[PDB]
Amino acid sequence: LEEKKQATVVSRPVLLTQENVPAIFDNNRTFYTKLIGERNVALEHVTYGTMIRVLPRFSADGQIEMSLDIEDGNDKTPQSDTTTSVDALPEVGRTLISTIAR
Amino acid sequence: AAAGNIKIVAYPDTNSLLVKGTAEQVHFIEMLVKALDVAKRHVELS
């Protein structure tokens, strides 16, 4: 065997808001499972996707300070040939960042 | 008056404080706020 590979992905969310107003952009995916109990029967769910929550504010010089909460997740896939691809195992990998920049 | 009748309420819609008191207690909190309000520096950690 002799293998080469290359992959590029560029994603970009855009959001518009006002001064001192919290805004949310969200692009998620929900996975519903059937927990067959008897009493507290429930539809349990997981959620993963791109998400921004920002709180912009103008400084005295004209710079923009922001309070960020960034999440970027996707669905990691195990081997499809084995039995664990038909049950409720979506191995989720996320990436969380929480900071303040100006 | 006393120090116990000063009311301070956050107003986040314009990012400002609301102080209610006498004419000498309002000037007393305004001099404290200008000492706690400084610009910060950025650190990048690798």
Side-chain angles (χ1 to χ4, degrees):
Chain A
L1 201 55
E2 177 173 355
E3 185 180 312
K4 300 281 183 287
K5 215 153 179 180
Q6 201 177 245
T8 68
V9 162
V10 176
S11 160
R12 172 202 188 170
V14 180
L15 175 69
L16 180 133
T17 173
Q18 290 188 329
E19 302 174 3
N20 318 308
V21 165
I24 288 176
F25 181 78
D26 202 57
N27 200 334
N28 63 82
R29 268 221 190 184
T30 309
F31 184 83
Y32 290 101
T33 189
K34 217 159 180 176
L35 290 183
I36 39 165
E38 324 280 357
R39 312 265 176 275
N40 302 112
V41 281
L43 274 180
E44 278 281 9
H45 62 275
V46 311
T47 306
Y48 53 92
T50 319
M51 168 185 216
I52 320 165
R53 178 180 63 157
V54 72
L55 175 45
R57 180 188 63 84
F58 281 82
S59 294
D61 317 325
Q63 296 168 322
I64 311 178
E65 196 174 64
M66 283 154 304
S67 160
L68 290 150
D69 259 5
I70 304 170
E71 169 181 300
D72 164 69
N74 50 289
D75 173 86
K76 309 302 184 179
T77 61
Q79 313 306 333
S80 296
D81 61 82
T82 179
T83 290
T84 189
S85 47
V86 306
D87 57 63
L89 185 133
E91 274 214 9
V92 177
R94 306 166 210 260
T95 301
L96 318 173
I97 281 176
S98 176
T99 181
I100 286 180
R102 185 214 322 145
Chain B
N5 43 39
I6 319 183
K7 286 300 292 288
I8 291 182
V9 164
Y11 184 50
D13 210 337
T14 49
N15 198 71
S16 81
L17 280 173
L18 308 181
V19 187
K20 166 155 163 288
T22 79
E24 292 89 16
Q25 302 173 305
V26 162
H27 183 81
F28 182 76
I29 309 297
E30 194 188 344
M31 287 283 111
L32 157 73
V33 158
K34 294 185 177 179
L36 302 176
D37 201 11
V38 291
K40 295 181 170 57
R41 298 183 265 179
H42 287 108
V43 192
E44 164 153 298
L45 165 80
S46 189

